[PDB]
CSV table of C-alpha atoms in Angstrom, one decimal:
chain,number,residue,atom,x,y,z
A,1,UNK,CA,27.7,12.6,-47.0
A,2,UNK,CA,27.2,9.8,-44.5
A,3,UNK,CA,25.1,12.2,-42.4
A,4,UNK,CA,23.2,13.6,-45.0
A,5,UNK,CA,22.0,10.2,-46.5
A,6,UNK,CA,20.7,10.0,-43.1
A,7,UNK,CA,19.0,12.9,-42.6
A,8,UNK,CA,17.4,11.5,-46.3
A,9,UNK,CA,16.6,8.4,-45.2
A,10,UNK,CA,14.6,9.6,-42.2
A,11,UNK,CA,13.0,12.7,-44.0
A,12,UNK,CA,12.1,10.5,-47.0
A,13,UNK,CA,13.2,13.8,-49.5
A,14,UNK,CA,16.2,15.8,-49.8
A,15,UNK,CA,17.2,17.8,-47.0
A,16,UNK,CA,17.0,21.0,-47.8
A,17,UNK,CA,20.1,23.2,-46.7
A,18,UNK,CA,18.8,24.5,-43.2
A,19,UNK,CA,17.1,20.8,-43.0
A,20,UNK,CA,20.8,19.9,-42.8
A,21,UNK,CA,22.1,22.7,-40.9
A,22,UNK,CA,19.4,22.4,-38.3
A,23,UNK,CA,19.1,18.4,-37.8
A,24,UNK,CA,23.4,17.5,-38.0
A,25,UNK,CA,23.7,17.1,-34.4
A,26,UNK,CA,21.2,14.8,-34.5
A,27,UNK,CA,22.7,12.1,-37.0
A,28,UNK,CA,23.5,9.4,-34.6
A,29,UNK,CA,20.1,9.3,-32.5
A,30,UNK,CA,18.3,10.0,-36.0
A,31,UNK,CA,20.3,6.8,-37.6
A,32,UNK,CA,18.9,4.9,-34.6
A,33,UNK,CA,15.9,5.8,-35.4
A,34,UNK,CA,16.0,4.4,-38.6
A,35,UNK,CA,17.4,1.6,-38.0
A,36,UNK,CA,14.8,0.4,-35.0
A,37,UNK,CA,13.0,-2.5,-35.0
A,38,UNK,CA,9.1,-1.4,-35.7
A,39,UNK,CA,8.0,-4.9,-36.2
A,40,UNK,CA,9.3,-6.3,-32.9
A,41,UNK,CA,8.0,-3.0,-31.2
A,42,UNK,CA,4.8,-3.7,-33.1
A,43,UNK,CA,5.0,-7.3,-31.1
A,44,UNK,CA,5.1,-4.9,-27.5
A,45,UNK,CA,2.6,-2.3,-27.8
A,46,UNK,CA,-0.2,-5.2,-28.7
A,47,UNK,CA,1.3,-7.6,-26.6
A,48,UNK,CA,0.4,-4.9,-23.9
A,49,UNK,CA,-3.0,-4.3,-25.2
A,50,UNK,CA,-4.3,-7.6,-24.6
A,51,UNK,CA,-2.9,-7.3,-21.2
A,52,UNK,CA,-3.3,-4.4,-19.6
A,53,UNK,CA,-6.1,-2.6,-22.2
A,54,UNK,CA,-7.4,-6.4,-23.5
A,55,UNK,CA,-10.6,-4.2,-22.9
A,56,UNK,CA,-10.6,-1.8,-26.0
A,57,UNK,CA,-11.7,-2.8,-29.8
A,58,UNK,CA,-8.4,-2.6,-31.6
A,59,UNK,CA,-7.1,-4.7,-35.0
A,60,UNK,CA,-3.2,-5.7,-34.5
A,61,UNK,CA,-3.4,-3.5,-37.8
A,62,UNK,CA,-4.9,-0.3,-36.3
A,63,UNK,CA,-2.3,-0.1,-34.2
A,64,UNK,CA,0.7,-0.8,-36.3
A,65,UNK,CA,-1.2,1.6,-38.6
A,66,UNK,CA,-0.9,4.2,-35.7
A,67,UNK,CA,2.5,3.4,-35.0
A,68,UNK,CA,4.2,3.0,-38.4
A,69,UNK,CA,2.4,6.6,-38.9
A,70,UNK,CA,4.5,8.0,-36.1
A,71,UNK,CA,7.5,6.7,-37.5
A,72,UNK,CA,7.1,8.1,-40.7
A,73,UNK,CA,5.1,11.6,-39.6
A,74,UNK,CA,9.0,13.1,-40.0
A,75,UNK,CA,8.3,13.1,-43.6
A,76,UNK,CA,4.4,15.6,-43.6
A,77,UNK,CA,6.5,17.5,-41.5
A,78,UNK,CA,8.6,20.8,-42.4
A,79,UNK,CA,8.4,23.5,-39.5
A,80,UNK,CA,12.3,22.8,-37.9
A,81,UNK,CA,11.0,23.0,-34.0
A,82,UNK,CA,8.3,20.3,-34.8
A,83,UNK,CA,10.7,17.8,-36.4
A,84,UNK,CA,12.4,18.3,-33.2
A,85,UNK,CA,10.0,17.0,-31.1
A,86,UNK,CA,9.2,14.1,-33.6
A,87,UNK,CA,13.0,12.9,-33.1
A,88,UNK,CA,13.2,13.5,-29.4
A,89,UNK,CA,10.1,11.8,-28.8
A,90,UNK,CA,10.8,8.7,-30.8
A,91,UNK,CA,14.7,8.7,-29.5
A,92,UNK,CA,12.8,8.2,-26.1
A,93,UNK,CA,10.6,5.6,-27.5
A,94,UNK,CA,13.6,4.0,-29.7
A,95,UNK,CA,15.9,3.8,-27.2
A,96,UNK,CA,13.7,2.8,-23.8
A,97,UNK,CA,10.2,1.3,-24.5
A,98,UNK,CA,11.7,-1.8,-24.6
A,99,UNK,CA,13.0,-1.5,-21.0
A,100,UNK,CA,10.8,0.3,-20.2
A,101,UNK,CA,6.8,-1.3,-20.8
A,102,UNK,CA,8.1,-4.1,-23.1
A,103,UNK,CA,9.3,-5.9,-19.6
A,104,UNK,CA,6.1,-5.9,-19.0
A,105,UNK,CA,5.2,-8.9,-21.5
A,106,UNK,CA,7.6,-11.7,-20.1
A,107,UNK,CA,5.7,-13.3,-17.0
A,108,UNK,CA,7.7,-13.2,-14.0
A,109,UNK,CA,7.9,-16.4,-11.2
A,110,UNK,CA,4.7,-17.0,-9.4
A,111,UNK,CA,6.3,-15.8,-6.0
A,112,UNK,CA,4.3,-17.7,-3.3
A,113,UNK,CA,4.4,-14.2,-1.2
A,114,UNK,CA,4.0,-14.0,2.2
A,115,UNK,CA,3.6,-10.7,3.5
A,116,UNK,CA,2.3,-10.2,7.4
A,117,UNK,CA,-1.5,-9.0,8.9
A,118,UNK,CA,-1.5,-6.3,10.6
A,119,UNK,CA,-4.0,-6.1,13.2
A,120,UNK,CA,-4.5,-2.5,12.8
A,121,UNK,CA,-7.2,-2.8,14.8
A,122,UNK,CA,-6.0,-2.2,18.5
A,123,UNK,CA,-4.9,0.7,16.8
A,124,UNK,CA,-8.4,2.4,15.4
A,125,UNK,CA,-9.6,3.9,18.2
A,126,UNK,CA,-5.7,5.5,19.4
A,127,UNK,CA,-5.7,7.1,15.8
A,128,UNK,CA,-9.3,8.0,16.4
A,129,UNK,CA,-8.5,9.8,19.2
A,130,UNK,CA,-4.9,11.2,18.0
A,131,UNK,CA,-6.6,13.1,15.3
A,132,UNK,CA,-9.4,14.4,17.2
A,133,UNK,CA,-7.6,16.2,18.8
A,134,UNK,CA,-6.6,17.8,15.7
A,135,UNK,CA,-9.8,18.3,13.6
A,136,UNK,CA,-9.8,21.7,14.9
A,137,UNK,CA,-10.6,23.7,11.3
A,138,UNK,CA,-12.9,25.9,9.5
A,139,UNK,CA,-9.7,12.1,-13.3
A,140,UNK,CA,-10.2,9.4,-17.0
A,141,UNK,CA,-12.0,6.0,-16.9
A,142,UNK,CA,-8.4,5.0,-18.2
A,143,UNK,CA,-7.0,5.1,-14.9
A,144,UNK,CA,-8.2,1.9,-13.6
A,145,UNK,CA,-5.9,0.9,-17.3
A,146,UNK,CA,-3.0,2.5,-15.9
A,147,UNK,CA,-3.2,1.8,-12.2
A,148,UNK,CA,-3.4,-1.9,-13.0
A,149,UNK,CA,0.1,-1.4,-15.1
A,150,UNK,CA,1.3,0.2,-12.4
A,151,UNK,CA,0.7,-3.0,-10.4
A,152,UNK,CA,3.1,-4.7,-12.3
A,153,UNK,CA,5.3,-1.9,-13.4
A,154,UNK,CA,6.5,-1.9,-9.6
A,155,UNK,CA,7.2,-5.4,-10.1
A,156,UNK,CA,9.3,-5.3,-13.3
A,157,UNK,CA,11.5,-2.1,-11.9
A,158,UNK,CA,12.3,-2.3,-8.3
A,159,UNK,CA,15.1,-0.5,-8.1
A,160,UNK,CA,14.3,3.0,-10.4
A,161,UNK,CA,10.7,3.5,-8.9
A,162,UNK,CA,9.3,2.5,-5.3
A,163,UNK,CA,5.9,3.1,-3.9
A,164,UNK,CA,4.1,4.9,-1.2
A,165,UNK,CA,0.6,6.5,-0.4
A,166,UNK,CA,-2.4,4.7,0.0
A,167,UNK,CA,-1.7,1.6,-2.0
A,168,UNK,CA,1.7,1.1,-0.3
A,169,UNK,CA,0.1,0.6,3.1
A,170,UNK,CA,-2.5,-1.5,0.7
A,171,UNK,CA,0.3,-4.1,0.8
A,172,UNK,CA,-0.1,-3.9,4.3
A,173,UNK,CA,-3.4,-3.6,5.4
A,174,UNK,CA,-5.6,-4.9,2.4
A,175,UNK,CA,-8.4,-3.1,4.0
A,176,UNK,CA,-7.0,0.3,3.0
A,177,UNK,CA,-9.2,1.7,0.3
A,178,UNK,CA,-6.6,3.0,-2.6
A,179,UNK,CA,-6.9,4.8,-5.7
A,180,UNK,CA,-3.8,6.4,-7.1
A,181,UNK,CA,-0.2,4.6,-6.9
A,182,UNK,CA,2.2,7.5,-5.0
A,183,UNK,CA,5.4,6.9,-6.9
A,184,UNK,CA,8.7,7.9,-6.7
A,185,UNK,CA,10.6,7.3,-10.3
A,186,UNK,CA,14.8,8.2,-11.1
A,187,UNK,CA,13.2,8.3,-15.2
A,188,UNK,CA,9.9,9.4,-14.6
A,189,UNK,CA,10.0,11.6,-17.8
A,190,UNK,CA,11.4,8.7,-19.4
A,191,UNK,CA,9.2,6.5,-18.1
A,192,UNK,CA,5.3,8.9,-18.4
A,193,UNK,CA,6.6,9.8,-22.2
A,194,UNK,CA,6.4,5.7,-23.3
A,195,UNK,CA,3.5,5.3,-21.2
A,196,UNK,CA,2.2,8.7,-23.1
A,197,UNK,CA,2.8,6.9,-26.1
A,198,UNK,CA,0.8,3.5,-25.0
A,199,UNK,CA,-2.3,5.4,-24.9
A,200,UNK,CA,-2.4,7.5,-28.0
A,201,UNK,CA,-1.2,4.3,-29.5
A,202,UNK,CA,-3.8,2.5,-28.5
A,203,UNK,CA,-6.5,4.9,-27.4
A,204,UNK,CA,-6.3,7.1,-30.3
A,205,UNK,CA,-6.4,10.3,-28.1
A,206,UNK,CA,-3.5,12.7,-27.8
A,207,UNK,CA,-2.8,13.1,-23.9
A,208,UNK,CA,-0.3,16.1,-22.3
A,209,UNK,CA,2.5,15.4,-20.3
A,210,UNK,CA,2.9,18.9,-18.1
A,211,UNK,CA,4.9,19.6,-15.5
A,212,UNK,CA,4.1,21.8,-12.3
A,213,UNK,CA,6.6,24.0,-11.0
A,214,UNK,CA,5.6,24.3,-7.2
A,215,UNK,CA,6.6,20.8,-7.1
A,216,UNK,CA,10.1,19.5,-7.0
A,217,UNK,CA,10.7,17.5,-10.2
A,218,UNK,CA,6.4,16.5,-10.4
A,219,UNK,CA,5.0,15.8,-13.5
A,220,UNK,CA,1.8,14.4,-15.0
A,221,UNK,CA,0.2,12.6,-17.5
A,222,UNK,CA,-3.6,13.6,-18.4
A,223,UNK,CA,-6.1,14.0,-21.5
A,224,UNK,CA,-7.2,16.2,-23.9
A,225,UNK,CA,-9.7,17.5,-21.5
A,226,UNK,CA,-7.2,18.0,-18.6
A,227,UNK,CA,-8.4,14.9,-16.7
A,228,UNK,CA,-5.6,13.5,-14.5
A,229,UNK,CA,-4.3,9.8,-15.7
A,230,UNK,CA,-1.1,9.7,-13.7
A,231,UNK,CA,2.2,11.6,-11.6
A,232,UNK,CA,5.3,10.9,-10.1
A,233,UNK,CA,8.0,12.4,-8.7
A,234,UNK,CA,11.7,12.3,-10.0
A,235,UNK,CA,14.7,12.1,-7.5
A,236,UNK,CA,18.4,10.9,-8.3
A,237,UNK,CA,19.8,8.0,-8.2
A,238,UNK,CA,21.6,9.8,-5.2
A,239,UNK,CA,18.1,10.1,-3.3
A,240,UNK,CA,16.7,6.7,-4.0
A,241,UNK,CA,19.5,5.1,-2.3
A,242,UNK,CA,18.6,6.8,0.7
A,243,UNK,CA,15.2,6.5,1.2
A,244,UNK,CA,13.7,4.2,4.0
A,245,UNK,CA,12.5,1.4,1.9
A,246,UNK,CA,10.3,-2.7,2.4
A,247,UNK,CA,10.6,-5.1,0.4
A,248,UNK,CA,6.7,-6.1,-0.2
A,249,UNK,CA,5.7,-9.1,-3.0
A,250,UNK,CA,8.6,-7.7,-5.4
A,251,UNK,CA,8.3,-3.7,-5.0
A,252,UNK,CA,9.3,-1.3,-2.9
A,253,UNK,CA,7.5,0.6,-0.6
A,254,UNK,CA,8.4,3.9,1.3
A,255,UNK,CA,9.6,2.8,4.8
A,256,UNK,CA,5.6,3.3,6.5
A,257,UNK,CA,8.2,4.4,10.0
A,258,UNK,CA,9.1,7.3,7.5
A,259,UNK,CA,5.6,7.8,5.6
A,260,UNK,CA,4.2,7.8,9.3
A,261,UNK,CA,6.6,10.7,10.0
A,262,UNK,CA,5.7,12.8,6.7
A,263,UNK,CA,1.9,12.1,7.7
A,264,UNK,CA,2.5,14.0,11.1
A,265,UNK,CA,4.1,16.8,9.1
A,266,UNK,CA,1.1,17.2,6.1
A,267,UNK,CA,-1.2,17.8,9.7
A,268,UNK,CA,0.1,21.5,9.8
A,269,UNK,CA,-0.8,22.3,6.5
A,270,UNK,CA,-4.5,23.8,6.9
A,271,UNK,CA,-5.9,22.5,4.0
A,272,UNK,CA,-5.5,18.5,5.4
A,273,UNK,CA,-7.3,19.4,8.7
A,274,UNK,CA,-9.9,20.8,6.5
A,275,UNK,CA,-9.9,16.9,4.6
A,276,UNK,CA,-10.0,16.0,8.0
A,277,UNK,CA,-13.5,17.9,9.1
A,278,UNK,CA,-15.0,16.4,6.0
A,279,UNK,CA,-14.2,12.3,6.9
A,280,UNK,CA,-11.9,12.2,9.6
A,281,UNK,CA,-12.7,8.2,9.4
A,282,UNK,CA,-10.7,8.6,6.2
A,283,UNK,CA,-7.4,9.0,7.9
A,284,UNK,CA,-8.4,6.7,11.1
A,285,UNK,CA,-7.0,3.6,8.8
A,286,UNK,CA,-4.2,4.9,7.6
A,287,UNK,CA,-2.6,6.1,10.7
A,288,UNK,CA,-4.1,3.1,12.4
A,289,UNK,CA,-2.3,0.6,10.0
A,290,UNK,CA,0.8,2.8,9.9
A,291,UNK,CA,0.9,3.1,14.3
A,292,UNK,CA,0.9,-0.7,14.2
A,293,UNK,CA,2.8,-1.1,11.8
A,294,UNK,CA,6.0,0.8,14.1
A,295,UNK,CA,4.7,-0.9,17.2
A,296,UNK,CA,5.1,-4.0,15.9
A,297,UNK,CA,8.3,-3.3,14.2
A,298,UNK,CA,10.2,-1.1,16.4
A,299,UNK,CA,8.5,-2.1,19.7
A,300,UNK,CA,6.5,1.2,20.3
A,301,UNK,CA,4.7,1.4,23.4
A,302,UNK,CA,2.2,4.1,23.1
A,303,UNK,CA,2.1,4.6,26.9
A,304,UNK,CA,1.3,8.4,26.7
A,305,UNK,CA,4.1,8.8,29.0
A,306,UNK,CA,5.5,12.3,30.5
A,307,UNK,CA,6.5,14.8,28.2
A,308,UNK,CA,9.9,15.6,27.1
A,309,UNK,CA,7.3,16.3,23.6
A,310,UNK,CA,6.5,18.8,21.9
A,311,UNK,CA,10.0,20.4,22.4
A,312,UNK,CA,10.7,24.2,22.2
A,313,UNK,CA,9.9,26.0,19.2
A,314,UNK,CA,10.6,29.4,19.3
A,315,UNK,CA,9.7,31.7,16.1
A,316,UNK,CA,10.3,35.1,14.9
A,317,UNK,CA,6.9,36.2,14.1
A,318,UNK,CA,8.5,38.8,11.8
A,319,UNK,CA,11.7,37.0,10.2
A,320,UNK,CA,10.1,33.9,10.0
A,321,UNK,CA,12.2,31.5,11.3
A,322,UNK,CA,11.7,28.5,14.4
A,323,UNK,CA,15.1,28.0,16.5
A,324,UNK,CA,14.1,24.8,18.3
A,325,UNK,CA,16.3,23.2,20.9
A,326,UNK,CA,17.6,19.9,19.6
A,327,UNK,CA,20.2,19.3,22.8
A,328,UNK,CA,18.3,16.4,23.9
A,329,UNK,CA,17.9,13.8,21.0
A,330,UNK,CA,20.8,14.5,18.9
A,331,UNK,CA,24.9,15.4,18.5
A,332,UNK,CA,23.7,19.0,17.3
A,333,UNK,CA,22.4,22.0,19.5
A,334,UNK,CA,19.4,23.4,17.6
A,335,UNK,CA,17.6,23.2,14.3
A,336,UNK,CA,17.1,26.8,12.4
A,337,UNK,CA,13.6,26.6,10.3
A,338,UNK,CA,13.3,29.1,7.6
A,339,UNK,CA,9.8,29.6,6.3
A,340,UNK,CA,11.1,31.0,2.4
A,341,UNK,CA,13.4,28.8,1.0
A,342,UNK,CA,14.8,31.9,-0.8
A,343,UNK,CA,16.0,32.6,1.9
A,344,UNK,CA,17.5,29.4,3.0
A,345,UNK,CA,20.3,29.4,0.1
A,346,UNK,CA,20.9,33.2,1.0
A,347,UNK,CA,21.7,33.0,4.8
A,348,UNK,CA,23.5,29.5,3.7
A,349,UNK,CA,26.3,30.5,2.3
A,350,UNK,CA,27.1,33.2,4.7
A,351,UNK,CA,28.0,29.7,6.6
A,352,UNK,CA,30.9,28.9,3.6
A,353,UNK,CA,31.0,25.0,4.9
A,354,UNK,CA,28.9,23.1,2.8
A,355,UNK,CA,28.3,19.5,3.2
A,356,UNK,CA,24.3,19.8,2.3
A,357,UNK,CA,21.5,17.5,1.3
A,358,UNK,CA,18.8,18.0,-0.7
A,359,UNK,CA,16.2,15.1,-0.2
A,360,UNK,CA,14.1,17.0,-3.4
A,361,UNK,CA,10.5,16.2,-2.8
A,362,UNK,CA,11.0,13.4,-0.1
A,363,UNK,CA,11.8,16.2,2.4
A,364,UNK,CA,11.3,18.8,0.2
A,365,UNK,CA,13.9,20.9,1.6
A,366,UNK,CA,17.5,21.0,2.3
A,367,UNK,CA,19.5,20.3,5.0
A,368,UNK,CA,23.0,21.6,6.4
A,369,UNK,CA,24.8,20.7,10.3
A,370,UNK,CA,26.9,24.3,10.7
A,371,UNK,CA,28.4,24.7,14.6
A,372,UNK,CA,26.7,22.1,16.1
A,373,UNK,CA,23.9,23.4,14.7
A,374,UNK,CA,20.9,22.6,11.3
A,375,UNK,CA,19.7,24.5,9.2
A,376,UNK,CA,16.3,23.4,7.3
A,377,UNK,CA,13.1,24.6,5.6
A,378,UNK,CA,9.8,24.0,6.5
A,379,UNK,CA,7.0,24.2,3.4
A,380,UNK,CA,4.1,24.1,5.2
A,381,UNK,CA,1.6,26.2,6.6
A,382,UNK,CA,3.0,27.2,10.8
A,383,UNK,CA,-0.1,26.8,12.8
A,384,UNK,CA,-0.3,29.3,16.3
A,385,UNK,CA,-2.1,28.5,19.3
A,386,UNK,CA,-2.4,31.5,20.7
A,387,UNK,CA,0.1,35.0,19.2
A,388,UNK,CA,3.5,34.2,19.3
A,389,UNK,CA,3.0,30.5,20.3
A,390,UNK,CA,3.7,27.4,18.1
A,391,UNK,CA,0.6,25.1,18.0
A,392,UNK,CA,1.2,21.6,18.9
A,393,UNK,CA,0.5,20.7,15.8
A,394,UNK,CA,2.9,22.7,13.4
A,395,UNK,CA,5.0,22.0,16.9
A,396,UNK,CA,4.9,18.0,16.2
A,397,UNK,CA,5.3,18.4,12.2
A,398,UNK,CA,8.3,20.6,12.6
A,399,UNK,CA,9.9,17.7,14.6
A,400,UNK,CA,9.0,14.6,12.2
A,401,UNK,CA,10.5,16.9,9.8
A,402,UNK,CA,13.6,16.9,11.6
A,403,UNK,CA,13.2,13.4,11.8
A,404,UNK,CA,13.4,12.7,8.0
A,405,UNK,CA,16.7,13.8,7.9
A,406,UNK,CA,17.3,11.0,10.5
A,407,UNK,CA,15.6,8.3,8.7
A,408,UNK,CA,17.5,9.3,5.3
A,409,UNK,CA,21.0,9.3,7.1
A,410,UNK,CA,21.0,6.6,9.5
A,411,UNK,CA,20.8,8.5,12.2
A,412,UNK,CA,18.7,7.4,16.0
A,413,UNK,CA,15.5,8.1,16.0
A,414,UNK,CA,13.3,5.5,17.1
A,415,UNK,CA,13.2,7.1,20.4
A,416,UNK,CA,12.7,10.4,19.8
A,417,UNK,CA,9.6,9.2,17.0
A,418,UNK,CA,8.3,7.6,20.1
A,419,UNK,CA,8.3,10.4,22.6
A,420,UNK,CA,6.9,11.9,19.5
A,421,UNK,CA,4.2,10.1,18.6
A,422,UNK,CA,3.0,9.7,22.4
A,423,UNK,CA,3.0,13.5,23.0
A,424,UNK,CA,-0.2,12.7,20.2
A,425,UNK,CA,-2.9,11.0,23.0
A,426,UNK,CA,-4.7,12.3,25.2
A,427,UNK,CA,-4.1,16.2,24.3
A,428,UNK,CA,-7.0,19.4,24.9
A,429,UNK,CA,-8.3,20.3,21.5
A,430,UNK,CA,-6.7,23.5,20.5
A,431,UNK,CA,-7.8,26.4,18.5
A,432,UNK,CA,-6.4,27.7,15.4
A,433,UNK,CA,-5.4,31.4,16.3
A,434,UNK,CA,-4.0,32.2,12.9
A,435,UNK,CA,-1.7,30.9,10.5
A,436,UNK,CA,1.1,31.7,7.5
A,437,UNK,CA,0.9,31.8,3.8
A,438,UNK,CA,3.5,29.2,1.8
A,439,UNK,CA,5.3,31.2,-0.7
A,440,UNK,CA,4.9,31.9,-3.9
A,441,UNK,CA,7.1,30.2,-6.8
A,442,UNK,CA,6.8,30.9,-10.4
A,443,UNK,CA,7.9,28.6,-13.3
A,444,UNK,CA,7.8,27.2,-16.5
A,445,UNK,CA,4.3,25.0,-17.0
A,446,UNK,CA,5.1,23.6,-20.2
A,447,UNK,CA,4.3,20.5,-22.0
A,448,UNK,CA,5.0,17.8,-24.1
A,449,UNK,CA,1.9,17.2,-25.9
A,450,UNK,CA,1.7,13.6,-28.0
A,451,UNK,CA,0.5,14.5,-31.1
A,452,UNK,CA,0.6,18.5,-32.3
A,453,UNK,CA,4.6,18.4,-31.4
A,454,UNK,CA,5.1,21.2,-29.4
A,455,UNK,CA,7.5,21.3,-26.2
A,456,UNK,CA,6.9,24.0,-23.4
A,457,UNK,CA,10.3,23.5,-21.3
């Protein structure tokens, strides 16, 4: 049997009755593995070694040695389950390595980038101001090497991997210190699994690809000692296409207009007001840069004008929701914001008319317009300035949340954003009376181990 001959080739032995029964369906993938040119491969691994890990003690043999051993470990393995892992991880390598890390050994054009420079200084005080009104609360060594690879990877994979956070803003204002590079991928696992191998192969130290459940399609690779190396959120091509983007020197970054919106929501989360009191300046720069981007780019002027923002955020201290009229900025009456995700899908079918949007970890909630009304979920602590009263800070995070939807759908948001940004100037420090808790979410903390062959979910 052609199939039997394939299994036999791969396992380098006569397949047991069980080994045949359990591996049949995988002849297709198994064959591709056998045929894989391990030489051209061993090449790419070394073209990446002297390219991003040039700082390591290793012969172009020690590497090919580890590589060839791995592509043969299916011989010294009899545990069905463990064979499944080897096949699974080998396939990923065979069918994706070249297209993902291999593309990082073909020099790109020396684009004479231009970039724009921002006077994120006139705004340095304006930011410090807003931030004060609110301050009212209470890692492996490979990371350098890996962040270095992402610098390039972002450049070689613009359509599948975009950027945000520190580094994304360091690309607008070079003085922004930056560490880990926040990314979104449509192929998070594929990427992490490939990079995970690259490292084990070079380094020799097994790493673990782990999946965190609280988070929407979150994944991260650590080392034997539980030290963070690099993470990433996965999104659909669906969602990727709708995310606000900007194109700086060969990479896409979430539109800073959008990131600013998110950072206003993040300020509701009590853990953040806590990060703020530690080092208030830490945020100054970021905020500033984002204030200046939106000013210069959309002609936003900080007049500290009127009110009309923040609008009304009526909260059910018990049924835990937050009706908020939007009669003003959008063609939909108000917005009901559920504090419990489960309770959203529960009550979201009692409407039937289903034409909702799921923006995964990008909005970290789902949005549904119905009856000229909006149903969405807020995933942070709601703050209260007084019993039964939403605190300006949450009030604003609530507005920004709704605006995130607007940006991903192309609706009007420029005027509202400005009112929102100015509602933040010159405002008396209000006390956090008390706050709610984020809703618990059990799940499967599973993880791919690079050498012991076990796949936990």
